[PDB]
């Protein structure tokens, strides 16, 4: 319900900070994890790599896995008169075979002996699969950059940006804070492999295995879908007869394929695109970021802790509070010792502010170890909340 909560709820969360000013800060992005960055007088940001997909990868080969036969035609000659022929034997949509069959007086020949026979049938593919080649480049990573403000929702999305190992340094705008500049590298994912697609379900398979599959196929850059290569793989020519020969096609191979792929890493996908779990290394600069809300008034009023203070998985706490006497204002937050003499701990939410009257403003802070006073607000009722961090 609040901005920056997603990362707080994650178990895998890194805290990074720049040891310089205007310098680059390195971070490592992984699926299922997030990174929180902080810097003096800069807002705290959350980074997450949510998607890694290949867009329109080169199609290597289309394999037919189910076909039908039509217009089967037979031609044969008597012993002594050479090899017969059919013009459709020149039509790339047909599968044909040449053979020899006994001939004689019983079937129109002068001599008894072997004769040449030929049979062709139009081959029509009804269901095919295609294997694609994914290039490391042209891979597209989606990264969400969310401002760690604590603001609420239940319209405040983090900026989403898509990049490629070939795209240049990105300048992402964060409404209200400026822009953040970052560059990434697909720093170590392999692709002599191939990705097999059997009707919206894909697998990652080794090459030379895909290329060896005994099934009719077509070079990747095709669109006719008619001139199949090695159709005999799905066709069987029965023993011929003097003037006719039967030709039957094997049944679908979708099944033989499925129960043949068991074992190979299955690959998710959607909208025709393949998805992977990528790994990125990036560097970002915050010199163009600034705090949203500087130059306001220091709330002079009251807050009622909306509910039970929460402990995160990262040695930090999330305090919900809602104004009270004042403008949409800055909040006076400060974690001190039991004596209220020195400042201890620090805020992860920075320049925490109230946008509305009765608008739960979540605040994530890091209390020191042991005892400390969480002082929220000012002099009518400065809110002293005791806290013990174990």
């Amino acid at each position: 319900y609040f901005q920056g909560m997603r990362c707080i709820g994650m178990s895998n969360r890194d805290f990074v900070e720049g040891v310089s000013g205007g310098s680059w800060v390195d971070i490592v992005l992984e699926h299922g994890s997030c990174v929180t960055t902080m810097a003096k007088n800069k807002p705290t940001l959350d980074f997450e790599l949510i998607k890694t997909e290949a867009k329109q990868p080169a199609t290597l080969r289309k394999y037919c896995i189910e076909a039908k036969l039509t217009n089967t035609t037979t031609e044969s000659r008597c012993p002594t008169q050479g090899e017969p022929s059919l013009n459709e034997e020149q039509d790339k949509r047909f599968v044909c075979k040449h053979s020899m069959v006994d001939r004689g007086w019983g079937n129109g020949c002068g001599l008894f002996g072997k004769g040449g026979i030929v049979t062709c049938a139009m081959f029509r593919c009804k269901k095919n699969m295609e294997g694609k080649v994914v290039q490391p480049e042209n891979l597209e990573y989606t990264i969400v950059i969310t401002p760690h403000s604590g603001e609420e929702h239940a319209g405040k999305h983090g900026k989403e940006i898509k990049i490629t190992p070939q795209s240049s340094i990105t300048e992402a705008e964060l409404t209200g804070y400026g822009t953040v500049t970052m560059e990434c590298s697909p720093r170590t994912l392999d692709f002599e492999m191939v990705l097999l697609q059997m009707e919206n379900k894909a697998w990652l398979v080794h090459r030379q295995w895909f290329l060896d599959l005994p099934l009719p196929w077509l070079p990747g850059a095709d669109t006719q879908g008619s001139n199949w290569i090695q159709k005999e793989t799905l066709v069987t020519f029965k023993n011929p007869h003097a003037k006719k020969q039967d030709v039957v096609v094997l049944g679908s191979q979708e099944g033989a394929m499925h129960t043949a792929l068991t074992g190979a890493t299955e690959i998710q996908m959607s909208s025709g695109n393949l998805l992977f779990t990528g790994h990125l290394k990036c560097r970002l600069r915050m010199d163009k970021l600034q705090l949203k809300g500087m130059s306001y008034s220091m709330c002079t009023g009251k807050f009622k802790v909306v509910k039970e203070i929460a402990e995160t998985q990262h040695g930090t706490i999330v305090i919900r509070v809602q104004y009270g006497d004042g403008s949409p204002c800055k909040i006076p937050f400060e974690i001190m010792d039991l004596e209220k003499r020195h400042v201890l701990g620090r805020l992860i939410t920075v320049n925490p502010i109230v946008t509305e009257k009765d608008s739960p403003v979540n605040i994530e802070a890091e209390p020191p170890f042991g005892d400390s006073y969480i002082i929220i607000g000012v002099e009518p009722g400065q809110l002293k909340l005791n806290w013990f961090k174990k």
Binding site: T70, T72, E75, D102, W105, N107, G108, H241, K244
Partner: protein
């Protein structure tokens, strides 16, 4: 059946209702009588097969289910049912 041609030669498109009956069609060289014995002769559809019925003069047929006695003819029929 529909009588057409295939490279100058007569071609017979045989339908299901002709199974078991003598096929006769006039030709310059007199009347031609082809005999169709195809067991798999069915309904005319996409699954056709097409082949030749040889001329057979005073010779018993062997390893064939179609033949004519005056002029070699091509034949085509479906196998559907």
């Amino acid at each position: 059946f529909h009588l057409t041609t295939r490279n100058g030669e007569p071609h017979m498109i045989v339908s299901r209702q002709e199974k078991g009956k003598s096929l006769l069609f006039k030709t310059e060289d007199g009347v031609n009588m082809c005999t169709l014995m195809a067991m798999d002769l069915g309904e005319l559809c996409e699954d056709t097969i097409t082949y030749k019925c040889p001329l057979l003069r005073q010779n018993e047929p062997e390893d064939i289910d179609c033949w004519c006695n005056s002029t070699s003819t091509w034949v085509t029929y479906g196998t559907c049912t």
